[model samples]
Target: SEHLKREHSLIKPYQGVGSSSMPLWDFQGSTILTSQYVRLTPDERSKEGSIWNHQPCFLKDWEMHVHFKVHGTGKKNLHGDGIALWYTRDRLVPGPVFGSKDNFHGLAIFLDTYPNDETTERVFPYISVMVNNGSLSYDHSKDGRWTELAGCTADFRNRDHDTFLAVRYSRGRLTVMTDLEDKNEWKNCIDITGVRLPTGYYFGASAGTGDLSDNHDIISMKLFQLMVEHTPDEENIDWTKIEPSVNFLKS
Candidate 1:
């Protein structure tokens, strides 16, 4: 039997430095790594492991699906955060560090652990899709320029150790879904619109744990482009047929 699909995969380790693969086009005018930092494992120094900008394709529409699990030491009781989908024009890698990268470039769908803000932690595991345009517009709430379109905090902790997260973007809207239970249907946590992302930029999941939150893992990620085809006859109509003069001539 032959497979009908093509697959390209990348494994970026935590504390593993270096940019991931390059996306379809380069929106930001800079190299992937602007700086370096401490490594997760003592043996490996800080390397560049940033996501790529696959923007041109995404300009029309796209969706990404991923399966991941977090293993906690359960020792010090540190926070084990999850991954996120980031669209940005900055060259710096997404964080364990805060405010290191510019947010105004695009948006991020965060499956966060610790309280990014105090108000949201009551829900435990939650999803927040944010648009960072350097100023607060629709769906934004940060003191800065970022806005949130949608959010939900279900009892994600039960199935939070490891789970499937999916994000879909189409017609200027973004949605986040997660399967916390073993059942077939995934629950929708966030839905947002008014996203103004450039046609090209970097995109991928960034995962990390800090002093408050510790060691974490990202198993795998996959992205798919929605199949679309346009027919000229359907798109290009005959204007002549509609002209009043043409009707008289035909008669």
Candidate 2:
């Protein structure tokens, strides 16, 4: 029951751009900071962009909840290139992979909205999770076909309501949850264990588009610290020595 307790330190409560204390930097592309939300990309054609927090958190265990909306008039099956939520060591750098640098060292959760050639009978808006360690490059040519760790199909775009995403990382496990509206109940999207990610990383979100377009908006981002007591041996462990995953396999 201790895990259910809502005991967490406030990291970034993105109520509004001016009200919030956290500083957001637009690294590249057409990222706009409106009065209400941070627009990652406009409802236009052919775009790539990213934004990141200026400060990095060093908490070992934490959870992040993001309120975002993706909608456009590009028909039902015409939108492209979803958004990416990141917790990485680097702050702001533009590149070809997911609006950020490829072969990055940290955790990356992708909310892919378009269905590529590999897509099966599933819908267009799909969600996938990947963790990269700087060694292998993200295969952008095949839409990260050979690099994705795990993923699932979900309709997360062009809805009449806003969407919610919650990512929790504690000990060696990672869990992802989603809610359509204020549903009180959160649906489990991805859950994996034995994941070892170090601290001292920045929190950020990015989005991209090709021929099609959508209004990629980040309404808010709330972060919380997970309450957990580390053992004597664990507390003495030097997290700086631990590196990101380089084996290029699902943990």
Candidate 3:
């Protein structure tokens, strides 16, 4: 399955690493670990997590895609907590181990399925992107603090097998699309950019189930980059001039 040569070279694969367990991918060692899950303690502070420490390239133009499924509930037990794509100064510890909304160190877009049934009487799922500089936003926003973003009531509560989700990051922006029913289409609503992600930090996904839910599973995840031919002097070219072997997929 060779997708694209130039783009494929940029993608580095890493997998789940739970708390008290060794990291799956040792960037310094060129190692990768996969198919791992972590359970969370009742206390908010005690949760299992993972990290992908060595990722090559601080890409100015690239894309990321991921799939996830979450099921659970409660203060002591929350369902489908969320994950982050981190670019930090220190590659020491990037995490699912991070504290609450008060802690700001990098950009975070949380695919929140944590039900806020008490205050808003809402039962749908939503997404939020929080920047380390105290700027926080949701997909659907009016005042810019928190908004509804995008949502679906597709019974995310049930999980016997797996579910799919994807995200794309490019041109100083990021987008998330779900593969709930189909692959080609994704619901895009949340757009919060410009938090200034530093280069050469650990990047990966994290998840944990709580008091109400026992197990959280991430079947598979991947990150991809888009390829383009860069030319110094050429600003425009005739499409017919290029060889037939050169294939292009429009974004």
Candidate 4:
């Protein structure tokens, strides 16, 4: 209980300010900061994109909460190429793969609002979590097919209905939670164990739009350091100097 309550203190908090108390930096495109939220994409129809990042932090375990909204005047199933939240060693490099580079190493959570095809029975506006080690490529042709570690479908549109996403990584387990404005209950989207990730990673967020468009806005991001108890082997290793293993075979 005490560990969960420790989330009140944020190591990095983005409260939609131009300066002071904001730890976000633009990596690509243009991100406008308003009094209430950071606009990642405008309502206009075009191929627009944006990426914002925060300073790197070294932590063996942590939890992150993001408040975001995606809404636009586009018709049903019209908008595309949704937003992505990242935790990687590399800071910012814009590319075609999900608004970032193709061979990205680290963790990425995608809040995709568009469906790539109509063959599948899964719902549109899906939420997925991924872990990359730079050895694998993200297949954009099929919309990251066969690369997703875990995923689910959920409706996250319209500004009137804001949404919250929470990610927790401890030891070798990772969990993702989401809740709508009215629900006030956190629903588990994905929970996977034996996820090996390294420390010293920069926190970043990005959004993109193609022919279709939407108003993608990031309201806030709250980072909380988790106080996890380490085992004898973990305590002996120096996490600062070691890099994460790309091979998932051991897990």
In order, candidate lDDTs are 0.45, 0.73, 0.40, 0.71
> Whole-model lDDT, candidate 2?
0.73
Error of 3 at 49 (Å): 1.6
Error of 2 at 209 (Å): 0.9
Between 2 and 3, whose lDDT is larger? 2
For each candidate in turn, the TM-score is: 0.60, 0.86, 0.56, 0.85
Model 4 lDDT tens row, 1-251:
34442223222233324455544465356466666777777776544455545556666788888888888888867776788888887867776655667678888888888777556556767888778878877766566766788888877788466798998988878899988656888898998887777777777777777777788877777777888788898788766554444235452
Model 1, position 167: C-alpha lDDT score:
76
| lDDT agreement of model 3 with the native | 0.40
Find the candidate with the highest TM-score and give its number.
2
Q: Candidate 2 deviates by what RMSD?
A: 3.9
Model 1 agreement with the true structure over 105-210: per-residue lDDT tens digits: 4666666555544343245455676666544332212212134456777444325445677777664567788876777677887766655455454555454443
Give stretches of model 4 more than 4 Å off.
1-24, 45-48, 240-251
lDDT of 2 by residue, 1-251 (tens): 24332222212343234575434444457787766777788888777777776566677888888888888888757887789888887857777565677778888888877666564554546676778778877665455667777666677787777788899988877889888756766898888776778877778788888887798888777777778888999989887556766243445
How would you encode candidate 3's per-residue C-alpha lDDT over 1-251 as one tens digit per residue?
23322322222232324356343443311112343422212223235443434543444345555555455434442444443434333343423322122233454545545453445444445454454433332322221134223233443334554566655555335565565654455655454343234333334444332332323334444555555443654324442222111112356
Ranking by lDDT: 2, 4, 1, 3
**Can you rank all candidates by TM-score, best first?**
2, 4, 1, 3
